[PDB]
Amino acid sequence: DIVMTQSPSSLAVSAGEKVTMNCKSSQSLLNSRTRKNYLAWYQQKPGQSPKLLIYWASTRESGVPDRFTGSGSGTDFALTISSVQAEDLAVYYCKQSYNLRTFGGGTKLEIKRADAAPTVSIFPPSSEQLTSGGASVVCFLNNFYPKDINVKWKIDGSERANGVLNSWTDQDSKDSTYSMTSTLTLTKDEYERHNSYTCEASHKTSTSPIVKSFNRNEC
Amino acid sequence: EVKLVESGGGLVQPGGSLRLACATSGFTFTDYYMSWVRQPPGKALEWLGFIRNKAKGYTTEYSASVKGRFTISRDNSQSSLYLQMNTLRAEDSATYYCARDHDGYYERFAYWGQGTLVTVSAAATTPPSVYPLAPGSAAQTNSMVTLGCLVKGYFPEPVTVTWNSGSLSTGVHTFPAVLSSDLYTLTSSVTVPSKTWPSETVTCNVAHPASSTKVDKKIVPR
Numbered sequence: 264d265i266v267m268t269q270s271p272s273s274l275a276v277s278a279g280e281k282v283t284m285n286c287k288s289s290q291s292l293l294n295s296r297t298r299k300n301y302l303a304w305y306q307q308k309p310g311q312s313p314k315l316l317i318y319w320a321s322t323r324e325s326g327v328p329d330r331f332t333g334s335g336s337g338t339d340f341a342l343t344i345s346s347v348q349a350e351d352l353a354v355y356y357c358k359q360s361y362n363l364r365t366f367g368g369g370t371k372l373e374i375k376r377a378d379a380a381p382t383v384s385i386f387p388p389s390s391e392q393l394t395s396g397g398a399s400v401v402c403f404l405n406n407f408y409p410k411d412i413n414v415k416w417k418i419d420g421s422e423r424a425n426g427v428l429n430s431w432t433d434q435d436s437k438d439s440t441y442s443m444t445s446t447l448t449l450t451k452d453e454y455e456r457h458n459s460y461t462c463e464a465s466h467k468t469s470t471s472p473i474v475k476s477f478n479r480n481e482c
Numbered sequence: 483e484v485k486l487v488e489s490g491g492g493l494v495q496p497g498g499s500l501r502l503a504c505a506t507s508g509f510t511f512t513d514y515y516m517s518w519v520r521q522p523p524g525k526a527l528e529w530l531g532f533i534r535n536k537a538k539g540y541t542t543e544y545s546a547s548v549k550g551r552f553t554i555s556r557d558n559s560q561s562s563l564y565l566q567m568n569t570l571r572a573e574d575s576a577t578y579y580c581a582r583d584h585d586g587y588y589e590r591f592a593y594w595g596q597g598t599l600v601t602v603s604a605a606a607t608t609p610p611s612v613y614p615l616a617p618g619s620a621a622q623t624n625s626m627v628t629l630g631c632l633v634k635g636y637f638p639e640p641v642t643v644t645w646n647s648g649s650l651s652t653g654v655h656t657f658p659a660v661l662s663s664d665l666y667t668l669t670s671s672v673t674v675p676s677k678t679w680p681s682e683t684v685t686c687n688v689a690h691p692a693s694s695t696k697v698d699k700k701i702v703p704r
């Protein structure tokens with residue numbers, strides 16, 4: 264019954280800039296006996312376990328960079344990053360331990376950087392997959408920014424939307440780019456009725472779609 | 483060094499039970515409260531409970547979301563911590579973490595394990611098909627070349643993908659799995675110097691712990 268809320272839910276900041284994120288509790292976390300606020304901050308980078316950054320509101324855990332500062336008291340707390348680095352991409356959670364423990368819902372910190380065009384690679388179905396009756400054609404759209412991007416598939420010059428699934432990665436911790444995979448899955452029998460397989464990428468960095476394709480006759 | 487390692491996660495039927503374990507080393511175990519925290523895929527952390535230290539007679543407390551349904555216990559002879567879950571439902575699908583908690587003074591979870599993923603579902607375990615993604619000859623003319631592995635048709639999560647047993651680590655993108663027809667599919671790409679391939683080998687190593695699957699697939703020129 265202590266409700267923790269964090270603000271904003273997400274935001275994007277460029278390297279070098281300051282970031283402020285906020286944490287509110289439904290009830291004071293100031294313990295009268297010890298005169299400390301029982302409020303910790305944790306950083307969870309993509310695919311990793313949460314790591315402790317700050318506890319008792321303002322105490323920085325050893326080994327945490329100096330650019331992280333906790334502040335606040337009672338029901339209102341903040342985590343401020345003085346100068347953002349690409350590696351700071353993460354979700355940041357506050358947590359009370361005044362009465363049992365309760366996490367806030369997190370603030371997702373994304374990194375803004377300069378626009379970048381994707382590198383596009385296309386791959387035909389493997390002979391292993393084909394022997395078993397299936398045919399997946401895969402296209403990677405790698406290291407681009409910002410996240411929005413559109414892929415079009417053409418089979419013998421005509422567009423196909425059925426059986427196309429897309430998946431974006433989380434932002435990269437080193438270059439702040441996104442990557443996306445587009446997989447078109449057909450049956451072997453349908454795959455074999457056509458020749459030209461084309462993955463087309465449309466991203467704000469060019470009015471020209473990036474086009475990669477292969478021809479079944481060529482292998 | 484301090485070490486915490488969860489085990490026991492995997493697929494369990496709705497209404498079933500599952501016990502997780504957390505093995506610790508590298509600190510005086512009985513001095514610490516220990517907590518369990520879970521995280522549904524893509525969602526926020528949720529604190530579930532703790533068991534106190536020796537000084538406070540090892541008693542337990544639970545969040546309201548799980549009180550009466552989950553039990554925490556510890557083995558102080560082996561420095562191990564347990565979470566027994568009963569009557570599992572879909573909302574319980576999550577990565578579960580053990581974390582070192584209060585030592586009677588400090589208010590912080592100073593250490594966390596890597597977490598173990600629990601999936602609550604009636605679907606059957608299905609091992610992945612792993613297919614090589616070899617670059618077209620048209621795509622081998624540049625400084626950098628991109629290879630991949632398609633890991634199709636498995637259930638439950640997770641799978642791991644490394645390249646050359648983990649020695650190729652930069653320039654890798656492993657894409658989040660997509661679920662369809664109650665099977666997951668994901669792919670991974672690695673981009674290397676054209677110098678290195680096909681002259682030196684590139685192999686993706688896929689494991690699917692729920693079916694004890696281990697696969698290496700060597701990417702060969704087509």
Ligand SMILES: C=CCO[C@]1(C(=O)O)C[C@@H](O)[C@@H](O)[C@@H]([C@H](O)CO[C@]2(C(=O)O)C[C@@H](O)[C@@H](O)[C@@H]([C@H](O)CO)O2)O1
Pocket residue numbers: 294296360361362363534538584586587589
């Ligand atoms: C003031 C009475 C007791 O304080 C101590 C003690 O001196 O024995 C020391 C405090 O640090 C705390 O450990 C309390 C007591 O064990 C309760 O500690 C918890 C608890 O519920 O077990 C957990 C703590 O993290 C914190 O949430 C406290 C809460 O501040 C109430 O004291 O409760 O014992």
Ligand SMILES: [Zn+2]
Pocket residue numbers: 541542543
């Ligand atoms: Zn009690």
